[PDB]
Every structure is written in structure tokens, then in C-alpha cells.
Design a protein around this ligand. Structure first.
Ligand SMILES: [Mg+2]
Ligand SMILES: [Mg+2]
Ligand SMILES: [Mg+2]
Ligand SMILES: [Mg+2]
Lengths: 587, 587
């Protein structure tokens, strides 16, 4: 498939197809030439590039089209289109001919270009993207159609989630020339010695056709050979562990040979680190970890949900400076670029599928037709990210109706799928909503870590921190009592805060209240032995749809959308730099 | 004169003439009836009540007029109009007849209503206010006239000071019925015993005609008689001192008798407290005091420079809560209501005449014709405020050209005037500008306390706190060395800060930089033994005129103009509540 990150090797010619494409919101015949009347950038969200609300709110098919000159392709090579993602659905066309299709707006997929065109001068690539969401998609949307009484159908998507339905081609599109017989997947696992000084490496290299020899060379951060094998197994000594905010990455250069000549070559990075959840603790390299960080969003001005590597590094640098150590890919898999960056910077990542909105506005599980999309999402995510040492936990869903009948039957095989697919068998969790109190919830028994989204003082007991403190402490103790050996992580807690709003009277929406809210929250958290992590909502302000509770988007960010700090940022840096990354609160 | 605060006694009927007056910007004949086409409130600034810039920027004569019904006036009584102030100049008319005049917009004055009208049904009061400032007025303005080539003269005042030229009747106007033979002044002094348990009280009661007996009764805060005398002197035991943020006020009920019957009665409050400047220290009740507080302004939205008692109490409550203890009446005498409030709340007050702008945009002292206005300002201020225990120091000028030739000759008799008029002989100071470095300044030898307005890091070394810290420390040590026994007080230091502006890179105008600026400043201040006080500029944002350095007024306030706090307020409360009111930094 297309799990492997696009690389430039001697056997793989990878070209970027980013830039300006002919664009159109509406119907189009791919047998016809899309004019240049409207253009659009790849990669980016198209929404904030539209000046009018009408075109910004567009729902349905929208087209990208461009004539691309064909490079040299040899006899033993094939040519594929590798999409980082297309949001949400896509049909791919080459010279008007349907050639590929994908559903899900946050996972990569590749599409084969017909071999009969490899000697043509040019090919026309048409991308039929679609941003419709319903009860069969992840994330879940409320779809509806209304006739404008002009004879036309106007589509509308009422989001079942708290973020703007940004759409377009958000991630790099690559034109890849690769051998027909190539490496399509590489799985790297390791068993650390008792003294943590040695490691037993296992490699699973998958090819689409037979090969005579699989040679694997391992290089350290000084690019020095530390091991080589033809048997896909290798013992290492004097190893250097991948540590929190102190990353060490090895490189596995995988070469396949046929008839004593190079067939294909690929390089996959990996890190040596151990993960275990036991006795109400989260262990990294056999030491108790305290999560400090953020729930994030792929969201910036202009680009919307589009990839911005500079934004990734800026955010992660701010994360490091504050004394934080982790973040969650809420509420969808982020770019591969972000994951690889997290690997390099030693940042812990809670990896998450777009399973948000599984909640009817009871009887949620008699209406959700998301099973197929949910299974694919888990399969794609694990296959894409399993080699990332930064990935330390999987999320099966964010705030589903886990208190309703049918919830357990829905999630039991999905939790199992994570365990079966992941070669590291990392802990999986479910991000719990406030309606599902310990007594009502019927799904948390399936997961390894209890993740809670709680807003005592904002949603419940609004502006009443006194009564809020009692409520949050009361429920946290209930969770600890119901699951005595499961670690607890707060994955969302915050208060909307507009920059410039001030008061001496602890007023919600002001910068002072955000400080007060978090100060109260932390006082409670520190008294719960099983609470091993705190991730705020959100890192930065982000765009949402139109509703009365949203004051031009979500303002629960510690930073503004332009990455400028709010008053509370200074307070978090004090706390997070006092609490070490390795912090045992069992003592 | 009109030094005594208007009171309601059995011999004094005091009526408030506040409310709606017929108003007109421009020429008017007081022999004629001003129509009600335009109206204006007393008391308030008229400026922000004008919707257009033209009328708001008006310079010249503007009129208030109202027909007022005459109350009962007996044979031995007279009727006067008592203005808290009129800004800046005023001519008062009764039935079209000129009857009083005053120059100076921040001091009280009374005007006698002609006795031939006491039996009339009504009288017409006309107030010809004027807001022109020049080189003969305090504060100093740059006056100019330009012909609009329509045949008319347009006047313009270019302020020589950093605050908006708000004008109008800013303070209560009273209609006072009093005996012809009345008490027109009361001076209260006291000598504290060596054990601070007793006090020798001296009273100087002034009447305009002869009286047979002056009886003075003294009551404590429980309204209990603690002493009485006919000889204007009284010894007190078990006295209760007036303390910083712990005020104790006594009341002197003064009665004058003629032929064994009551002629007039008035009550004047006073406090028992001792002040002395010696050995680089400011002593209150013989203990080293550390000033913590603000340079302020009589400034609020809507009312402008108009009296707002609620605003006074709100500000003083904020002052008390932060751990502060003092403020300065920059740059003009404030309302009597504010002074009396400060007496009640135990807040230290640095009292200041409108001597701001004595600086040519060298040769300042060959152009300033302010001597007469300056002498009157000192006379009026001392006579009005000498009995206030809150008043602990006088200011002779704010940022004058004290480095130019002629400065010493100008200020020497003015400093002397303070010492001669004030029965308590309180310390007097001069607020020094940054251009007048210790080597250049030729006036600070005259004063008892060195007051400095310094902006290292904002005006000099803008956004360079590193080089700013060196500069401020260097000069402060020079001042301490040039005047080894004079206490130093920072009367202005701050940075413009717009609410909502944020950055991680110590950027000027942001809320973070304001914190950084003050943090650096305090580090320096704490290393200077002779520095006995810190007063920030400003307490709150305030209105100024139009110039490129002013982003809609002055934003150096710790609070916004609506009295909402900025980020730095929290930092000041921490520091000011750690440093006691009585704090000796000689140790
Ligand atoms: Mg909460
Ligand atoms: Mg703790
Ligand atoms: Mg300074
Ligand atoms: Mg100190």
C-alpha cells in the first residue's frame, strides 16, 4: 500500500506535484479541460482562500486539475500518485479515466498511473475531492439537502464536532517512480535488555514480488554502521535509548537484491524505547512518566488544516520551552511530517483516529453506520505510524456516547484491532466525555488508560471555581476507585479566553480567569495519585463553525491562533518546569 | 477667601447648583438670555460630550447660564457662589453684571452675590469659562491664532504637557448662605510628645470681623468630646495617631460668639502625625517609610477631568488592595473630595501645583511669564490643603527645564513660598526630567526630596532592558552621590501597554514587556539605599492630544481607563504586599 513515507533514493524518483492547480467548486467532466478561471494551491485548505461565505461554505464535489509532464520511466518501473491525504473523499482521474478512490480525509493513499501512458508526453490528473460528512464517515457529520426552489440541490453538513470542516488537499502530493518489485512496508520492533544496554532488533520487510536477498544496514546518529544482517534480525550493544525531549534515532537502510543486483532501497528511522502501563502508572523506559502538554489541532490562519512544517516546529519549540513533553493528535491523524518531527524532538504523541462525533444530538449506536470507516482508520493509522517511537498510545474514539447501550459491543472489536495490528502492542485509550460519569460509562474497562475531557468551572459550574473544585475532585476519586490500576490522563481542560479581556473579579473569558481555572484544576490533579498526565485544551485558538457558544472559533488556547501567548502561558511554564518528565506520584 | 470646604451647618446653608445649564461655545452677551439650544452638565468636562471633533477642539470663551431661584437670606447673612474650580479661566456674572474673576483651572474661589438681589425672586448666573493656555498660565500651553480667511479667528492651544486639555466646570458649584461675620479660615497644627502618647494642639481661627469668644470643641472618631478651649490651644492625652492605611481623624468644631449668641459654626477635620526628612530617609511618625503607589490623573471616560467620587473610591480601594500606600496629584491639585478621602483612608499624598510645561520646545526662562500664576497656585494650594494629614509633601514643578540658566533663580523663591505658607513646613520637591542629569541640573539643591521621572528601557534604550538597566543604575548612583542625605523617589516609570498585545520576545507595547520593564526597574531600585519610594506612571490609561507617540491617549497605566487590570497588576500586588509600609533600607 502507501504506508511508507515518500523518499528520494537511487531506485525511487520522487517528485512533488505541489503548486497551482485549475480549480472548480461544482460539477465537472474529467474528459473535458478545466479552464484556469479559478485556481487553487496544493497543499492547503481551500476555505479561507474564498472571499465569500457562499464559496467558503460549499459542500459537495470540487475539482483540482493540471496537465503534468511525464518523466523518464524505465521498463522495470511503475509510476504512482501518492497523496498525503485528500479531505474528505477523493476520486482520482488520469486523462478522464477513473484510476483510484479513497475515503477518509486524514490518511495517505497511492494510485497507479496506467502503464500505457509512461511514454506519453503529458498526462492530465484530475482530483475529484468531496467534503460531505454523514453517519458513515469519520468524523461524523449531520448531512441534509434542501431545494432552493430554483431546481437545484443545496447540500449542508452540520458538524458533530467542535472544529471547522476545513477541506481540500491538505498534504503533499507526490509523483513516484519506483520499481515494480519494491519494498511496500517495513516493520521494526525491538526487545530491550535487562540492563537497557543492549537490544534485539526484528525486521519485517514486505515486497510485492520475490527477492533473493534482503540486506539491512543499521546506522546511528553519527551515520556510522553499527550492524548488518541478511536474516532480518540483529543484536545491538552499547545502544542509545530514545528519551523524552532527548531523542535518539537509528536508521535502517533496507536493500532488496535480485540476481545479485540492487532492486530497491529504502531508509526507515526507528527509536529504542520501552512502554508499559501498570499499577496506575505510565512507564517509559521502566520509569514513571508525567504527561505535560496539549490537545492540538492542525490549524493555522490562511492554510487552515493544510500542512505547515514551520508551524509544526514553532509549536513544538514552544512545547519544549514551556517544559511540556507531549501532545495528542486531536481529532484525526496529523501529517507524517509532524510525526517524524516528534520522533526527532523526543515528544510523546497520543495518536488518534478521526472517530469524533459518535454521539447523537439516546440511541447513538442504532444510528451510527461508522463501523467500516472506523476499521479502515485504525488499519491505516497503525500501518502508517507503528514505527514512530514518539507514538506511545492510541485513541479509539474522542467523546463518543460511551454511556449508551451498544457502546461496549461497538468498541470491543475496535480496541482489539489496535492490539492485533500494532506490533508493539501499545496501550490504547478512549477519550471520555463528561456525560459518561464512572457509573454511567460502560466502555472504559476495555482500554488501558483512562482519558478524561473535563470542564468543571467552564461548562458545569460556569464561573464558579469553588463548586467546580468539589465536582472535579469528587469524580476523579470515583474514576480512581472504579479502576484502581488504570492511569488517568486529563486530555482536555480549559476555558475560552479572548486576548485583551481583563477583570479583577474572576470573570470567564478574561485572561485572569484562565489562570484561575487552571490553578484550581492543578490543585485537584496533584491530590490524585493515579492521575499521571495533564493535556490542556487547547494549545492555540482554532477555527470552528457558527454557533452561539463560539465567539469566532474556539478560544481555549493557551496561545492565540497567531502563536502569541496569553497570560496563563507564563504560569504553565513555571509549573511544567518544576514537575520533571519522570515524576512518580506514588512515592 | 474660599479655602474652607463647603459645609451644611446651622449657620451655613449650602445648596448645590449642579445639573443642566444653558450652554454655548462662542460669544455671548450676559445681558441677553442664553437659549436652551445647547445644554451642559455641571460638573464635567464638556469635551467628550461633543460628538464632533470641531466642537471638542474648541478654544476660547464658552458660556454656562441658568436662572436660579433665590432662597431666604436674613439681614446678617450674605450669599456667595463657591466654585470648586473652573478650567481654566472664568468671569462670573449675576444678571449681566461682572461680579467675579479667577485664573487657574484647578483651585477653588468664591464670588459674592450683590446684596441688592437677596429679595429678588430669581437671579441669572452666567459663567464665562475660557480654556486658553499660554506662557502666562499654569499649565503652560503654546497659543496661536490663524485666520480662516473667512474673516474669523481660529484659536489653537498646543499643549506643553502630556494630557488632554479637558475643560469646563469640573467641580461642584455651591450657592452658600453664610453670616457676614463668619469664619473664613482655620489652621490646625500639633506637636507630638516624645512618647507619641500626647499632643499639643494649636488653632488659628480667622474671622472677617471681631468676635467676643472663639470656642473650639474636639471630638474623636467615636464622636466623643476629648477637649475644649477658648484660648485656641489644647493639650490632649491618650491620642490616636494618623497612620498609613490606618487613618485616625479628629474633628474640630469651631464656634464664634458675639454678645453671648452663636455667630457661626464650622467643623474641620485633622490628623495627628509627624513628618521629617533626614539622612536619606522619609520619616512618618519617626519611622522610615517606603512609598508604593502611582502618579495619577483626574481622568475617566465621559466625565474627562470632571469629579467622580465613585472613581476616587474605586481607585483608592484598588490602591489599598495592591499593597500600595500613596499617590501624586499629577499634574494639578485634585478635588477636595479626593483629598478628604485620602485623609479617611490613610493614603499618603504628594500635593502638586499645575506647574507643568515650564520647558521650551534652550532659553526657557527668558520666555516663561508664569511667575504670577505660579505664586498664586502655591498660595491657593497650601491654604486649601494644609490641614490634610494625607498631604506629606509639596511639588513645586513637574519636569521643568531645570538644567538651563535661570532655573535656580526662578525656583528659589517658590520653594521658599511653600516653606513660609505651610504651618507644618512639610518637605517640598521638584519632579525632575531625564534631560536634567545630576551634572546638568541646577535646582535639586533647593528641595528636600529628589523626585525623578525616568524611562530607561522605553524612551532611552527602547526595548533594550539590558542596556537600560546599566543606564538607570548608573544615574541613580550619581544622584545618591551628589545628594548623600536627600531621599530619592521615582515619581514616574512605565511603558505604554495596549490590552491584548502579546509576545514571547519582550516586545514593547505588549503586556509581557510591561512586566519585564518593571521587573528590571525594581531590581535596580532595591540596590539603591537612598531610594525610598516608587510611584508608577500611570495608575490608569488617560486621554492626551494628537501626536504620533500617542496611540489614542497614554497607555502607561497599570489599569486600563475602565479600571480593568493589565497583566502587570498581579506582579505589583506580589511585590507591594511583601514590602511593608514602614521599610528601612539602611538596616
Ligand atoms: Mg475540570
Ligand atoms: Mg504533581
Ligand atoms: Mg527607568
Ligand atoms: Mg527594597
Amino acid at each position: 500500500n502507501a504506508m511508507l513515507y515518500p523518499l528520494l533514493t537511487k531506485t525511487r524518483n520522487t517528485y512533488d506535484l505541489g503548486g497551482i492547480w485549475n480549480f472548480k467548486l461544482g460539477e465537472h467532466n474529467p474528459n473535458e479541460l478545466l479552464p484556469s478561471d479559478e485556481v487553487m494551491v496544493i497543499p492547503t485548505s481551500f476555505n479561507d482562500l474564498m472571499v465569500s461565505k457562499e464559496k467558503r461554505d460549499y459542500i459537495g464535489d470540487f475539482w483540482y486539475e493540471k496537465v503534468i509532464e511525464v518523466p523518464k520511466v524505465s521498463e522495470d518501473e511503475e509510476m504512482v500518485l501518492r497523496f498525503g491525504s485528500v479531505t474528505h473523499q477523493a476520486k482520482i482521474y488520469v486523462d478522464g479515466v477513473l484510476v483510484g478512490e479513497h475515503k477518509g480525509g486524514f490518511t495517505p493513499f497511492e494510485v497507479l498511473v496506467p502503464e500505457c501512458k509512461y511514454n506519453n508526453e503529458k498526462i492530465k490528473v484530475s482530483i475529484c475531492a468531496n467534503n460531505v460528512l454523514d453517519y458513515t464517515t469519520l468524523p461524523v457529520g449531520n448531512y441534509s439537502e434542501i431545494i432552493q426552489e430554483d431546481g437545484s440541490i443545496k447540500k449542508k453538513v452540520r458538524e458533530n464536532f467542535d472544529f471547522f470542516n476545513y477541506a481540500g488537499v491538505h498534504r503533499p502530493l507526490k509523483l513516484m517512480i519506483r520499481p515494480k518489485n519494491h519494498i511496500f512496508d517495513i516493520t521494526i520492533t525491538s526487545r530491550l535488555s535487562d540492563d537497557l544496554q543492549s537490544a534485539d532488533l526484528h525486521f519485517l520487510v514486505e515486497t510485492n514480488q520475490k527477492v533473493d536477498e534482503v540486506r539491512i544496514s543499521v546506522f546511528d546518529e553519527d551515520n556510522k554502521l553499527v550492524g548488518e544482517t541478511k536474516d532480518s534480525r540483529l543484536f545491538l550493544s552499547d545502544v542509545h535509548l530514545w528519551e523524552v525531549l532527548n531523542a535518539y534515532l537509528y536508521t535502517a537502510r533496507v536493500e532488496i537484491f535480485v540476481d545479485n543486483q540492487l532492486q530497491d532501497v529504502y531508509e526507515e528511522n526507528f527509536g529504542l524505547r520501552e512502554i508499559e502501563v501498570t499499577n496506575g502508572q505510565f512507564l517509559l523506559n521502566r520509569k514513571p512518566i508525567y504527561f505535560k502538554g496539549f490537545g492540538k489541532h492542525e490549524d493555522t490562519f490562511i492554510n487552515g488544516r493544510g500542512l505547515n512544517e514551520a508551524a509544526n516546529l514553532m509549536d513544538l519549540n514552544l512545547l519544549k520551552d514551556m517544559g511540556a513533553n507531549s501532545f495528542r493528535t486531536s481529532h484525526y491523524p496529523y501529517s507524517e511530517e509532524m510525526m517524524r518531527l516528534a520522533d526527532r524532538m523526543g515528544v510523546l504523541v497520543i495518536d488518534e483516529v478521526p472517530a469524533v462525533g459518535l454521539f447523537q444530538n439516546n440511541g447513538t449506536w442504532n444510528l451510527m453506520q461508522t463501523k467500516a470507516a472506523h476499521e479502515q482508520a485504525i488499519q491505516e493509522l497503525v500501518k502508517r505510524d507503528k514505527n514512530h517511537p514518539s507514538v506511545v498510545m492510541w485513541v479509539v474514539a474522542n467523546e463518543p456516547a460511551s454511556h449508551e447501550a451498544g457502546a461496549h459491543d461497538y468498541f470491543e472489536p475496535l480496541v482489539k484491532l489496535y492490539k492485533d495490528l500494532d506490533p508493539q502492542k501499545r496501550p490504547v485509550t478512549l477519550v471520555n466525555i463528561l456525560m459518561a460519569t464512572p457509573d454511567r460509562d460502560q466502555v472504559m474497562d476495555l482500554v488501558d488508560v483512562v482519558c478524561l475531557n473535563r470542564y468543571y468551572g467552564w461548562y458545569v459550574d460556569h464561573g464558579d471555581l469553588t463548586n467546580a473544585e468539589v465536582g472535579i475532585r469528587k469524580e476523579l476519586l470515583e474514576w480512581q476507585d472504579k479502576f484502581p490500576d488504570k492511569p488517568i490522563i486529563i486530555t482536555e481542560y480549559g476555558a475560552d479566553t479572548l486576548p485583551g479581556l481583563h477583570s479583577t473579579w474572576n470573570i470567564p473569558y478574561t485572561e485572569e480567569f484562565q489562570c484561575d481555572f487552571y490553578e484550581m484544576s492543578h490543585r485537584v490533579f496533584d491530590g490524585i495519585p493515579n492521575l499521571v498526565g495533564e493535556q490542556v485544551w487547547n494549545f492555540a485558538d482554532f477555527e470552528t463553525n457558527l454557533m452561539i457558544l463560539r465567539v469566532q472559533g474556539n478560544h481555549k488556547g493557551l496561545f492565540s491562533r497567531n502563536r502569541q501567548p496569553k497570560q496563563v502561558v507564563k504560569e504553565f511554564k513555571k509549573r511544567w518546569m518544576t514537575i520533571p518528565h519522570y515524576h512518580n506520584k506514588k512515592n
